[PDB]
């Protein structure tokens, strides 16, 4: 299995809705600094999942136009993403929030800030990883 182009952008026909799942698998580059997964709506980023190896954190936020909201960084356990290590991310959309699991284990919830779920119809992946698979 080769690699997807990076950054990778693709439409999510129908957008989001309760029970909607988006899966991604890949490998964090050996000296990765950061990478991100965005769920977009028009010119806004409804959900920005941003693991950072330089800060050893997983940042989540929303951007309306060019205005970033308040970041959410809480984690129930140690940073699950590791440089040079393969990973899988599962994003499950519920009515009130997104539930995110990494490597098969739930990591956090993100309450919807952009609530018109069907309008969240674009996925963007960028940064320091080798993207090997996406299931929209
Ligand atoms: C190429 C480029 O310049 N685009 C960047 C953008 C912006 O342009 C940025 O001004 C320059 O990097 O930032 C990107 O990352 C930002 C994003 O992860 C947000 C999410 O909250 O955080 C920004 O950093 C915050 C930092 O976390 C805070 O502690 C600090 O108080 O404020 C910073 C600035 O708001 C990231 O820069 C982006 O995805 O928009 C990366 C792009 O490459
Ligand atoms: Ni496939």
Cα of 134 vs centre of ligand 2, distance in Å, is: 6
Residue owning the nearest CA to atom 18 of ligand 1 = 50
Is 55 marked within a binding site? Answer: no
Query: Which residue segment(s) compose the domain that 92 sits in?
Result: 1-136
Q: What is the spatial distance between Cα 83 and Cα 110, in angstroms, rounded to a whole number?
A: 24
Q: How many domains does the chain have?
A: 1
CATH number for 48? 2.60.120.200
Is 62 marked within a binding site? Answer: yes
String of DSSP letters for the chain: -----SSEEEE-TT---TT-EEEEEEEE-TT--BEEEEEEETTEEEEEEEEETTTTEEEEEEEETTEE---B---SSS----TT-EEEEEEEE-SSEEEEEETTEEEEEEE-SS--GGG--EEEEEESEEEEEEE-
Contact 87, 103 (CB under 8 A): yes
């Amino acid at each position: 299995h080769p690699a997807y182009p990076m950054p990778f952008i693709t439409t999510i026909l129908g957008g989001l809705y309760p029970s909607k799942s988006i899966l991604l698998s890949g490998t964090v580059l050996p000296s990765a600094q950061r990478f991100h997964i965005n769920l977009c709506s028009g010119n806004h980023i409804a959900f920005h999942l941003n693991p950072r190896f330089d800060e050893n954190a997983v940042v989540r936020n929303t951007q309306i136009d060019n205005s970033w909201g308040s970041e959410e960084r809480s984690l129930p356990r140690k940073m699950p993403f590791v440089r040079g290590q393969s990973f899988s991310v599962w994003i499950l959309c519920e009515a009130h929030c997104l539930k995110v699991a990494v490597d098969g284990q739930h990591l956090f919830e993100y309450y919807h800030r952009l609530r018109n779920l069907p309008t969240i119809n674009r996925l963007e992946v960028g940064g320091d990883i080798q993207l090997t698979h996406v299931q929209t």
